[PDB]
From a paper:
The sweet receptor is a heterodimer composed of TAS1R2 and TAS1R3,3,4 two type 1 taste receptor family members that share the distinctive architecture of class C GPCRs: a large extracellular Venus flytrap (VFT) domain, responsible for ligand recognition; a cysteine-rich domain (CRD); and a seven-transmembrane (7TM) domain that mediates G protein coupling. To address this gap, here we present cryo-electron microscopy (cryo-EM) structures of the sweet receptor in the inactive, unliganded state, as well as in the activated, sucralose- and advantame-bound states.
In the presence of sweeteners, the human/mouse sweet receptor adopts two distinct conformations, which we refer to as compact and loose. In the compact conformation, the VFT LB2s remain packed; in the loose conformation, LB2s of the two subunits disengage. Advantame also yields well-defined ligand density in the TAS1R2 VFT pocket of both human/mouse and human/human receptors. The closure of the TAS1R2 VFT clamshell induced by sweetener binding leads to the formation of salt bridges between LB1 Lys65 and LB2 Asp278, which are brought into proximity in the compact state and engage further to form stable interactions in the loose state. By contrast, in the compact state, the inter-lobe interface remains largely preserved relative to the apo state, with the distance between the LB2s changing by only 0.7 Å. First, agonist binding induces clamshell closure in TAS1R2, accompanied by a stabilizing salt bridge that defines the compact state.
Author numbering:
A (entry chain B): 23 to 353, 367 to 388, 392 to 561
B (entry chain A): 25 to 44, 58 to 340, 358 to 555
Write the structure that this text describes.
């Protein structure tokens, strides 16, 4: 097929692109001894679909005249191979000098001409960090789909990183707003022991402390189960939940860990709880396949509301049909992409047309870069100030205060590089013969929520309180991972409250007595 | 100038001279100390006729402002001597400006550099980065260390706490990667060994001479209030030295006293914090650090962008006495790293101890050799584990304030190959009669008196008498009272039954 040949196109300005077009054959994941090149022949459809989205966006920009009238926009796409070494190899070629095979070392780098205008960023957060530290020394704009870690928000270390997906902090803010709205003050936090849960747990704990929600305990859970020791630690965590008397659990964990937890919970029952889901978990059927899941108690979470791109399906099918035409070769940038005849795709993900959100995000990233260039050239309806060739650090100024139209949505990067985008609140319906997700609210910075659609399991709202003040008659004990809570003990008859700020119920003298919950010791 | 020295083969050196363009930040004395350590090591190797006969060893050193200015030094080191860096499929025949890099001082800079040099397999040795993630040699094939990792530091802390039976501790962490990582790691280690963390707090990131705002000040007030209320008198701090300047002054403002402070290496031997005389009244300070190795004659030696420092010499001269009385602890790692590179190069040239043949060195071959070195440097052998670490000893140090003698007295020694704390000596406590201070959630119960838990912490329990007719077989369960045989009875407070109707 003629497919890999389609991934580069000429233009006055060229967008670079990093995509997961494939990965290295699995046995290759072993230590390098000599700096040879790495094979990456394990083709993947996900990267193909995302690259097709980028190509569609650029072709639309070339067809129309709402942006960049009379001049040509191109692209040049490389595979990340999900591999840091290959990613760095590809990333360097973007910054290499124009039409040249080398890159040069200079002190202050606002003096230089790379061979691309901007880079549409990599898929995974690890590569996003690795490349963002690199590109931002050159101050080349990087617009990333699918990278949601909050580390990349920092303008000091990632001054040129942009993304068309919300950071995890927005989702966790929605979570904390929900907890406040239902007055669930005493909660347990769980996250997968991979880096995603690490970041999520840190952010959630800090926000909860700031907003006055007390975390009972903060447990990492195994990303996958392979050993009796991991089963041991997860069972220990689950019994620790019960010991805390918590009723609401925030489970910001990748789907595999949650599937493990609920496998055990179904096997030995535990007890019903309220679970607030990571969006990455809530999306998946895997957990919901477990038998008689209604035993678990209500599952809730927030879901991103992306726009439609119906024309994309026919675009992909058209270009695949063209790639199958041997005469279309007259119309090299991927390994084995050219071997993929249409059965491999039509038997699978093509019938699905959360991948949708990433397709839209890639489209919007291309449109954002095009709008930024349209601004920098200060184009009229039919004219542009093209007298000088733009440099990447010049776009960077315009991108912080523009707004761009992603085919129906109006989007703009905030002061630290994130799009402002709203969420749905969804709850699993279990009254039907099968689990169904239903929408019961929205978060657009404020939690607009519809109480009448909340089918709670006991037909009554769950509660999880802790005391943050104690009465005159009760003595304090502290609890919580940050000493956020108290609970109050009734100081018994024959003992008395020494003073209202003390931590010890005090026995009354041997010749004296006191009532129940007494403040005094009496003759 | 100090930052450059020509030779046949050049070592790249990365150090953080300035705290917090990179000239304008304040100078940190420790970084200048380490830079002088590297310079002295190269001086010795050039004077010595044994190790590299007839071959000049040069160096080229660049400043790294913590997480800033990490890309440019790497690009400079990798260039092909004309400032151009070619892009290729395979680099086996490439010749960079430097043959090896004595890598940065902190984990994040180390990883940033490693993700770059991993492409070229140019060997990187870091002297003070302790993160355990660096052991992944699929992720970091070119990375080695002359220092133990955070695993062993936390193990040393745990064994210190177990020796004195400190069940009940407070953990304070900075609001950044280092504190977060080490706090979670200590959480892992503590739970399985019978110790309980009362509470954990993230300290605010405050610049030492910045005017602190009301919100930050009330945050600190809240933290010190929590410290003052809690019965846990042992505190572990995972933070850079820069942020503790405000924290300890707030602790002083609240008239807090009587704790034991356990210092992570990031500040355990900082001379600047040590010079705050008012800390003497807070309690006992203990810290985890690398062993002392007296480098013979290094003290006498201690007397294109980002390769300059004006303030360095003037700033160092005042601390010279303190650094001289100290034990040259972290200096040894840099010295040993330079000597490791030197021995590996000596072997790579196939050099006899008469003269070496001079030939092009492709860095991946030098990396090949570095894995195999095994030699005695001053007394200790230095060789690399399969995971790239060198098994140097750690020590637990107590701060002393008689300026006429050593400021950091060694009170215990830790062996990473035995994974054991050893040779504990006399700590001089803050207590009224030098009795070992302790921190326990609840007192030991009497005989005939069962336990009953108060909450999540296993360490906390009530003591409850077994009712008459029941007894407490502590060997089976301390939390339950067993019923006496029908021919026996039990009193209010006794361990086992006696014959009675
Ligand atoms: C993110 O880590 C941190 O913020 C802290 C503080 C720090 C930041 C930047 C540069 C150095 C230290 N890191 C460490 O202390 C690392 C452990 C690791 O980073 O894995 N051990 C260094 C021990 C000898 C040392 C050398 C240079 C010193 O000043 C230039 C210094 O004070 C102490």
């Amino acid at each position: 097929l003629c497919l890999s040949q389609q991934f580069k196109a000429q233009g006055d300005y060229i967008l670079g692109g990093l995509f997961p077009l494939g990965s290295t054959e699995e046995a290759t994941l072993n230590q390098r001894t000599q700096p040879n090149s790495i094979p990456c022949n394990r083709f993947s459809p996900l990267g193909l679909f995302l690259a097709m989205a980028m190509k569609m966006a650029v072709e639309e920009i070339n067809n129309g005249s709402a942006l960049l009238p009379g001049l040509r926009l191109g692209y040049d796409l490389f595979d990340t191979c999900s591999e840091p070494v290959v990613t760095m190899k590809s990333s360097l070629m973007f910054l290499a000098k124009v039409g040249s095979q080398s890159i040069a070392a200079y002190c202050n780098y606002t003096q230089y001409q790379p061979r691309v205008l901007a880079v549409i960023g990599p898929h995974s957060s690890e590569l996003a960090l690795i490349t963002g530290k690199f590109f931002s020394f050159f101050l080349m704009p990087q617009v990333s789909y699918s990278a949601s870690m909050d580390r990349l928000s920092d303008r000091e270390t990632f001054p040129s990183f942009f993304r068309t997906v919300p950071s995890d902090r927005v989702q966790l803010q929605a979570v904390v707003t929900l907890l406040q709205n239902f007055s669930w003050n005493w909660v347990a936090a769980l996250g997968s022991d991979d880096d995603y849960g690490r970041e999520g747990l840190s952010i959630f704990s800090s926000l909860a402390n700031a907003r006055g929600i007390c975390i009972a305990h903060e447990g990492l859970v195994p990303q996958h189960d392979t050993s009796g020791q991991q089963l041991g630690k997860v069972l220990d965590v689950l019994r620790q939940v019960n010991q805390s008397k918590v009723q609401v659990v925030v489970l910001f964990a990748s789907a595999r860990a949650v599937y493990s937890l609920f496998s055990y919970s179904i096997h030995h029952g535990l007890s019903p709880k309220v679970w607030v889901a990571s969006e990455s978990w809530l999306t998946s059927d895997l957990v919901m396949t477990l038998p008689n899941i209604a035993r678990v108690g209500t599952v809730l979470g927030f879901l991103q509301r992306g726009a439609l791109l119906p024309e994309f399906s026919h675009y992909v099918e058209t270009h695949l049909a063209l790639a199958a035409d041997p005469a279309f070769c007259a119309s090299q940038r991927c390994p084995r992409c050219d071997d993929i005849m249409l059965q491999n795709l039509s038997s699978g993900l093509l019938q699905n047309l959360q991948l949708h959100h990433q397709i839209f995000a890639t489209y919007a990233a291309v449109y954002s870069v095009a709008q930024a260039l349209h601004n920098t050239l200060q184009c009229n309806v039919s004219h542009c100030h093209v007298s000088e060739h733009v440099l990447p650090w010049q776009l960077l100024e315009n991108m912080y205060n523009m707004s761009f139209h992603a085919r129906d949505l109006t989007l703009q990067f905030d002061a630290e590089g994130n799009v402002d985008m709203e969420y749905d609140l969804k709850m699993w319906v279990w009254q039907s013969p099968t689990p169904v997700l239903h929408t019961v609210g929205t978060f657009n910075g404020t939690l607009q929520l519809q109480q009448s659609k909340m089918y709670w399991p006991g037909n009554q709202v769950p509660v999880s309180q802790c005391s943050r003040q104690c009465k005159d008659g009760q003595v304090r004990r502290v609890k919580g991972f940050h000493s956020c809570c108290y609970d109050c003990v009734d100081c018994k008859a024959g003992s008395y409250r020494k003073h209202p700020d003390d931590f010890t119920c005090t026995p009354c003298n041997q010749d004296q007595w006191s009532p129940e919950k007494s403040t005094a010791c009496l003759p | 100038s100090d930052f450059y020295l020509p030779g046949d083969y050049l070592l790249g050196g990365l150090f953080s001279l300035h705290a917090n363009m990179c000239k304008e930040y304040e100078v940190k004395v420790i970084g200048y100390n380490l830079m002088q350590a590297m310079r002295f090591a190269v001086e010795e190797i050039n004077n010595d006729s044994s190790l590299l006969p007839g071959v000049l060893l040069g160096y080229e050193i660049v400043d790294v402002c913590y997480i800033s200015n990490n890309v440019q030094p790497v690009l400079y080191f990798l260039a092909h001597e004309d400032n151009l860096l070619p892009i290729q499929e395979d680099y086996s025949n490439y010749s960079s400006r430097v043959v090896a890099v004595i890598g940065p001082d902190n984990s994040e800079s180390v990883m940033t550099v490693a993700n770059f040099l991993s492409l070229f397999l140019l060997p990187q040795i870091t002297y003070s980065a302790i993160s355990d993630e660096l052991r992944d040699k699929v992720r970091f094939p070119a990375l080695l260390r002359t220092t133990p990792s955070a695993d062993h530091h936390i193990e040393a802390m745990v064994q210190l706490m177990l020796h004195f039976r400190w069940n009940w501790i407070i953990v304070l962490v900075s609001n950044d990667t280092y504190g977060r990582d080490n706090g979670q790691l200590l959480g892992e280690r503590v739970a399985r060994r019978g110790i309980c963390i009362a509470f954990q707090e993230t300290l605010p990131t405050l610049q030492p001479n910045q005017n602190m705002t009301s919100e930050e000040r009330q945050r600190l007030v809240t933290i010190v209030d929590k410290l003052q209320q809690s019965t846990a008198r042992v505190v572990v701090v995972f933070s850079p030295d820069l942020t503790l300047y405000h924290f300890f002054n707030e602790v002083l403002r609240q008239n807090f006293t009587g704790a034991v402070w356990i210092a992570s290496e990031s500040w355990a031997i900082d001379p600047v914090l040590h010079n705050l005389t008012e800390l003497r009244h807070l309690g006992t300070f203990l810290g985890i650090t690398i062993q002392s190795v007296p480098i013979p004659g290094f003290s006498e030696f201690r007397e294109t962008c980002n390769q300059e420092c004006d303030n360095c010499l003037n700033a160092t001269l005042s601390f010279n006495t303190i650094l001289r009385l100290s034990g040259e602890r972290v200096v040894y790692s840099v010295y040993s790293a330079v000597y490791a590179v030197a021995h590996a190069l000596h072997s790579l040239l196939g050099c006899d101890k008469s003269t070496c043949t001079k030939r092009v060195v492709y860095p991946w071959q030098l990396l090949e050799e570095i894995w195999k070195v095994n030699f005695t440097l001053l007394d200790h052998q230095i060789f690399f584990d399969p995971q790239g670490d060198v098994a140097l000893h750690l020590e637990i140090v107590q701060w002393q304030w008689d300026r006429s003698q050593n400021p950091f007295q060694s009170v215990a020694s830790y062996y990473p190959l035995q994974r054991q704390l050893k040779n504990i000596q006399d700590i001089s406590w803050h207590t009224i009669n030098n009795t070992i201070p302790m921190s326990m959630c609840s007192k030991r119960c009497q005989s005939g008196q069962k336990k009953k838990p108060v909450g999540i912490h296993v360490c906390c329990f009530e003591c409850i008498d077994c009712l008459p007719g029941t007894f407490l077989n502590h060997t089976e369960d301390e939390y339950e009272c067993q019923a006496c045989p029908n021919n026996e009875w039990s009193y209010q407070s006794e361990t086992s039954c006696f014959k009675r109707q």
